[PDB]
Design a protein around this ligand. Structure first.
Ligand SMILES: Nc1nc2c(ncn2[C@@H]2O[C@H](COP(=O)(O)OP(=O)(O)OP(=O)(O)O)[C@@H](O)[C@H]2O)c(=O)[nH]1
Ligand SMILES: Nc1nc2c(ncn2[C@@H]2O[C@H](COP(=O)(O)OP(=O)(O)OP(=O)(O)O)[C@@H](O)[C@H]2O)c(=O)[nH]1
Ligand SMILES: Nc1nc2c(ncn2[C@@H]2O[C@H](COP(=O)(O)OP(=O)(O)OP(=O)(O)O)[C@@H](O)[C@H]2O)c(=O)[nH]1
Lengths: 150, 31, 427, 438, 427
């Protein structure tokens, strides 16, 4: 994951290896924002904005790209919480547009970043790859010793 | 030294001293 | 049963299918992953008009995407629903179009028609019986016009018995960005008028005006405009999916819509466009709907039919309405403008009522129109064609391809015939 | 099993061998003492060395080779080297008198009393070995002692043993450089004698080897060490099939059966594509395509021949390292599609591929690069006749004025044999255009 | 009981078998050490058809491994299952091949045929009643064709009443690596047509395409490439070992496949081949299997039978199917391409359905084809053989071994005889 401190946005790419049987496309995600929960009900686009203008006196004539009389109350703001920098710690639950995922390692600066941010210091790696099993060993046939033992 | 004197950018048209005497090797080692 | 296979072509067709499909998936409540979340049995009874089944409750879209520049597809694939899109469905090319129609119609199309035809016939055999096909592209978009003209010409002979629904956006009247766009459009419309049966006409300044007029939000994204027109495409298709006594088949709509073969170019109309305070300042009633329905400002297709007259009009109403309000609304509007219709045919309103409201709004609708307001559109392009063909500007490319000025001669001759064709019937 | 015996005549062919066991002991990790570390590879002598060395119950890796030389100076010097304890003393067959650059003196005056001893060496090596696929001969044409002495021994090993292979490796005479004017004399004497007995004679030229050094290896002042290192790598690559395995394994018997068209001519060309410097490999990448382009580039062969003046007959490439057939068969397919490439229409297929997984190794104190994918390119073409064409117009001049004949006729030779070689040579060219003419 | 004993010949069959038996081992669930882990009774029931039991729960594979080169044989014994192969069954020689057909057919074979005949008849007496034998080798293989031609001849007279199943791979048309391979192939096929009853034709180029098409993993291993083909003959052998309402005997099958004696060359065909995400993007249904089951891209054997026509076709179906869907699929394909079959025989389809799916997948099938597509193969070798014979290149070896051009005369003349005969029957 790649969270950006200039826009408060995140990005996701893939580390698929050789012979993975998967495409070469890297960025599995946009560079946009991640809603705090699963697929949000589409808020009838046509009002999904930030600012609120009140009336246009522009269409009367043509001087500029019409007049923008703003408001003072800013109603209709629907609540869209987003995955910000607060919930960042090794081991967590995150739903990435429908992806219930976990957290196990951080890169290099997050260590310094996290100590500065609140106070946290305990950062330990956590295994996310599957455990491995050995190939045991070999044995040898029973012997009657008919001749030299070796 | 500046950037690299130990090896100086093979094809190095400018001369070096020690162009005679001990020779018979590659570029970097003699330099 | 009768289903539909979708085609997305051109880099706006790449724009549109992305927004068009996600609205549908959001409409039926499928997560981006693909695990359908069962909440409505009525959306659980007609998914196979558009979608086939995959294992694990996955609905595979029956759409084939074609382009040339991978970064478009990589963006398309890496979007909210690219995972519901098939890499099987991703056919593309190794070259840059140069946004040249001749390249996309003869040069790189030659070795890519084989792949798409195999892909579509594999998908055609995947499904049982079709209403037809629809294509999202642009008439002024060089790759979209390039393949689309080829594809629509091809899909005719294998299946001359289905719907050749077409969805093309009319380029910007004041500035075409692409300077050879008028050359591209004139070539395509020659084949378009011959190959198509129905045509959707869309313009972005009208959308830009809609963005100014009712959206009132200064700076939207182009995808926001894509949502607006995808809602139009949803509404016309909600007819087929949803129950309620309304006749949905495009043939049913088309035969009621077109009196003479040359009529393929039709204009849309949508349902309440609402601004910041007016969501809770509105009493959603069929009169004020019907008022806002027949607003020249509420129009979004090309330009005001105030200049001309109305040949055929068809509106579909979505929500909990009744036969009587829609009836009297015509009885209202018919007397409101009796003269603005043609004396050739009276009773020109074609009404269908969908009882299934959209998700989030109750009383909605859609309108499809065929008025005498297309003349200026190809009249506008006529001066452009005559002027640049007056001194054959930017022509050395297409000759190097192997094209000739003679093709341009019959192309304009056909379009000029459509000018009289439209002019003579109404005037 | 899978083993051979290697032979080195003339002090010219001895330093070139010394490097190869220096080389061969490196990839096998042979300590100069003669034994491995506490790791267990010794036994009845059956391991990676069983094809190369003889690490018997004594535990000492004994190379399966005999060095034969006529002048003790160099062979004594290597006998005072670092691996002298490894080498068998009287396998290092030495001499007290030279052949005076004379083909016949080394073939008649001294070779008789020495061949019996080396015949005793080969039989005592013949009995111990089991598979004995053939022999490895390093020699030279312009050999003061390599020329004459190898000729007689090759005749004797041919008559008693005619069922196994004989691999001939020699430095070809420099076309425009001659350190000796009698070099054309003994050289053609070798060729006419060896045409009807030698199995596979492969050549190389030092000038182009040096040309490579300051072209891509970027060494304007190399030494024999590097040239000997380069050729030692070449024989290492061809012998890599013997040591390791791969996707497919090929043997010298396949090489002989699949390279030579017809009798007489058995003289292909060798080439190694990834001849680059360390830093060049450092910030660049190697793949089958460019090295395939590299190995087929006309300036990369060690023979002063332009293939566009000839036509291609055979091509044998030994892909050693990490590779897949996919890009390989695709790349060579593009090579077949190439128009400048000129094979004879007689052979629609002419490509002998050998895949070996083992990555080629660098040598300590060496100058090669860090190669993962490598190839030795073995090819034979018709652009070779100009070499003997150069030799004859060189030779026909001195013969008419019969220079230095008093030297050879003084020690007991005559002219008829010198007469034979010229039409024996003239036979060689006329065959070349006859096979060249489609 | 009716059983089969295998022969591992040629250095390719050395890789062919090594993957082939481990595919047998893991499907039945035996560990590499050889101690079977009792999991399925039916595989426990029908394991005797190929294996014998020794002491301690260990199934001995009943085959003979033959070569000349120790190291390749060294690689397989050191393989993960070399322990399950018998040092008794490892027969070989003290000589090198030279990749020479004549040496292994007259010189090297002479002192090796005696021992291999002893081993097989020892193995033959070990079992009760064989259906026949199957052989993995190559027609262009240096020693494999050298050993195979000898052994197939000798096994003819000793048991002229059994199945002489032969499995050979055709070399790459673009390049044969070995340049005397056309001599090697032509020498072999002369005796192959005389002695064999069944032959599978395999080419790596189409197999190389398959990796580019569905495997989509760029760099495979030839063992993985063996893994592809190892599934093929395993499928036809599953019919023998598995229960279910389908007839198993190759004689039940071969007579259904062979209208005339000279028909021995048959092509394999496999069922669903799946790519990166298509595992979870595929709704496993008999129709979509059937279409992919009949795909020229799914063809892997030699080349496209699009150029020719279909004599006999047979697909065996492995999994939980029913007689009706396969029936309608046969009816579907019959109506689709009716002219592409031969009017000589209608209803040329032979189908068997195995109720026991593979380990890991449920829906599967295997196809054997005898179409009119082998013509291009032996015309290719026809000009190859003539041109190198037009000036007898590379001939001094075989005269030295004792071979003469008269042998080559009838080998191609019989080859020319097969040219017209395959041509005449279809054309
Ligand atoms: N994706 C995208 N397309 C746009 C946008 N605005 C306009 N378009 C138009 O969509 C048209 C059709 O796309 P394509 O048919 O794929 O275009 P093309 O053949 O690849 O080449 P050009 O049209 O010259 O770019 C283009 O001509 C653009 O003018 C936008 O904001 N985003
Ligand atoms: N093989 C080999 N040749 C070399 C070497 N250095 C120089 N040469 C060339 O090889 C030739 C050696 O041939 P000869 O001089 O006839 O060697 P010889 O027959 O063993 O007897 P001498 O004359 O005593 O050396 C010289 O003419 C050099 O041009 C080397 O290290 N190895
Ligand atoms: N084992 C193996 N054989 C291959 C492979 N690729 C191609 N082959 C061919 O398969 C053929 C059959 O091998 P064999 O019949 O055992 O060969 P041989 O008789 O020992 O002599 P050669 O064919 O010269 O190797 C060989 O000739 C190769 O050309 C591969 O990857 N592995």
């Amino acid at each position: 994951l790649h969270y950006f401190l200039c826009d408060g946005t995140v990005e996701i790419r893939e580390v698929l290896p050789s012979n993975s049987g998967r495409d070469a496309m890297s960025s599995f995600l946009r560079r946009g924002k991640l809603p705090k929960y699963g697929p949000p009900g589409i808020y009838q686009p046509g009002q999904i904005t930030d600012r609120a203008v009140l009336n246009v006196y522009g269409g009367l004539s043509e001087w500029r790209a019409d007049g923008y009389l703003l408001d003072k109350y800013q109603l209709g703001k629907v609540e869209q919480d987003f995955y910000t920098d607060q919930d960042l710690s090794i081991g967590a639950t995150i739903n990435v547009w429908g992806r219930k995922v976990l957290l196990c390692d951080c890169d290099e600066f997050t260590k310094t970043y996290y100590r500065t941010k609140y106070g946290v210091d305990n950062f330990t790696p956590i295994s996310c790859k599957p455990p491995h099993l050995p190939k045991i060993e070999r044995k040898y046939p029973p012997y009657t010793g008919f001749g030299s033992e070796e | 030294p500046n950037l690299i004197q130990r090896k100086a950018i093979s094809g190095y048209a400018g001369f070096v001293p020690r162009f005679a005497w001990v020779m018979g090797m590659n570029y970097r080692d003699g330099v | 049963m009768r289903e539909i296979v979708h085609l997305q072509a051109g880099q706006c067709g790449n724009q549109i299918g992305a927004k068009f499909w996600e609205v549908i998936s959001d409409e039926h409540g499928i997560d981006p992953t693909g695990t359908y979340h069962g909440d409505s049995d009525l959306q659980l009874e007609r998914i196979n008009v558009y979608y086939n089944e995959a294992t694990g409750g996955k609905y595979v879209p029956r759409a084939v995407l074609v382009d040339l520049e991978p970064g478009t597809m990589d963006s398309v694939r890496s979007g909210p629903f690219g995972q519901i899109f098939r890499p099987d469905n991703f056919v593309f090319g190794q070259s840059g179009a140069g946004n040249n129609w001749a390249k996309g119609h003869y040069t790189e199309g030659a070795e890519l028609v084989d792949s798409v035809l195999d892909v579509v016939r594999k998908e055609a055999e995947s499904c049982d019986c079709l209403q037809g096909f629809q294509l999202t592209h642009s008439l002024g978009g060089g790759t979209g016009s390039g393949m689309g003209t080829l594809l629509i010409s091809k899909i005719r002979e294998e299946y001359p018995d289905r719907i050749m629904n077409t969805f093309s956006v009319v380029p910007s009247p004041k500035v075409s960005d692409t300077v050879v766009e008028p050359y591209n459009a004139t070539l395509s419309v020659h084949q378009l008028v011959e190959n198509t049966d129905e045509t959707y006409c869309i313009d972005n300044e009208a959308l830009y005006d809609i963005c100014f007029r009712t959206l009132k939000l200064t700076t939207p994204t182009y995808g926001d405009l894509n949502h607006l027109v995808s809602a139009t495409m949803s509404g016309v298709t909600t007819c087929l999916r949803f129950p309620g006594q309304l006749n949905a088949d495009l043939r049913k709509l088309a035969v009621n819509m077109v009196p003479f073969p040359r009529l393929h170019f039709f204009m849309p109309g949508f349902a309440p466009l609402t601004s910041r305070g007016s969501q809770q300042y509105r009493a959603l009633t069929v009169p004020e709907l019907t008022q806002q329905m027949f607003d020249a400002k509420n129009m979004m297709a090309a330009c005001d039919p105030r200049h001309g007259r109305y040949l055929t009009v068809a509106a579909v109403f979505r929500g909990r309405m009744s036969m009587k309000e829609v009836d009297e609304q015509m009885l209202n509007v018919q007397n409101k403008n009796s003269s603005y219709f043609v004396e050739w045919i009276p009773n020109n309103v074609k009404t269908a009522v969908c009882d299934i409201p959209p998700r989030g709004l109750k009383m909605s609708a859609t309108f499809i129109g065929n008025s005498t307001a297309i003349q200026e559109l190809f009249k506008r392009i006529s001066e452009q064609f005559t002027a640049m063909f007056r001194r054959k500007a930017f022509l050395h490319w297409y000759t190097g391809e192997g094209m000739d000025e003679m093709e341009f001669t019959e192309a304009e001759s056909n379009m000029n015939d459509l000018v009289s064709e439209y002019q003579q019937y109404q005037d | 099993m899978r083993e051979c015996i290697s032979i080195h005549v003339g002090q010219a062919g001895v330093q070139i061998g010394n490097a190869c066991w220096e080389l061969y002991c490196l990839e096998h990790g042979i300590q100069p003492d003669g034994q491995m570390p506490s790791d267990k590879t010794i036994g009845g002598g059956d391991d990676s060395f069983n094809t190369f060395f003889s690490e018997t119950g004594a535990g000492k890796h004994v190379p399966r080779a005999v060095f034969v030389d006529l002048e003790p100076t160099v062979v004594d010097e290597v006998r005072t080297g670092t691996y002298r304890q490894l080498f068998h003393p009287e396998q290092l067959i030495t001499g007290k008198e030279d052949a005076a650059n004379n083909y016949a003196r080394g073939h008649y005056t001294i070779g008789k009393e020495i061949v019996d001893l080396v015949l005793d060496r080969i039989r005592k090596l013949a009995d111990l070995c089991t598979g004995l696929q053939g022999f490895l001969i390093f020699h030279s044409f312009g050999g003061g002692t390599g020329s004459g002495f190898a000729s007689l021994l090759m005749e004797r090993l041919s008559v008693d043993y005619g069922k196994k292979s004989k691999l001939e490796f020699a430095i070809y005479p420099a076309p425009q450089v001659s350190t000796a004017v009698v070099e054309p004399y003994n050289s053609i004497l070798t060729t006419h004698t060896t045409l009807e007995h030698s199995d596979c004679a492969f050549m190389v030229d030092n000038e182009a080897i040096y040309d490579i050094c300051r072209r891509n290896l970027d060494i304007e002042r190399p030494t024999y060490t590097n040239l000997n290192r380069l050729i030692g790598q070449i024989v290492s690559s061809i012998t890599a099939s013997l040591r390791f395995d791969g996707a497919l394994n090929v043997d010298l018997t396949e090489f002989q059966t699949n390279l030579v068209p017809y009798p007489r001519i058995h003289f292909p060309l060798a080439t190694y594509a990834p001849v680059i410097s360390a830093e060049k490999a450092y910030h660049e990448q190697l793949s089958v395509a460019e090295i395939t382009n590299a190995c087929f580039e006309p300036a990369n062969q060690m023979v002063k021949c332009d293939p566009r003046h000839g036509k291609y007959m055979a091509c044998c490439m030994l892909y050693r390292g990490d590779v897949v057939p996919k890009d390989v068969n695709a790349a060579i397919a593009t090579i077949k599609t190439k128009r400048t490439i000129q094979f004879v229409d007689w052979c629609p297929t002419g490509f002998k591929v050998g895949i070996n997984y083992q990555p080629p190794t660098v040598v300590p104190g060496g100058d090669l690069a860090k190669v993962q994918r490598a190839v030795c390119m073995l090819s034979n073409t018709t652009a070779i006749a100009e070499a003997w064409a150069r030799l004859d117009h060189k030779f026909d001049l001195m013969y008419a004025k019969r220079a230095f004949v008093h030297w050879y006729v003084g020690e007991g030779m005559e002219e008829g044999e010198f007469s034979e070689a010229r039409e024996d040579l003239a036979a060689l060219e006329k065959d070349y255009e006859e096979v060249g003419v489609d």
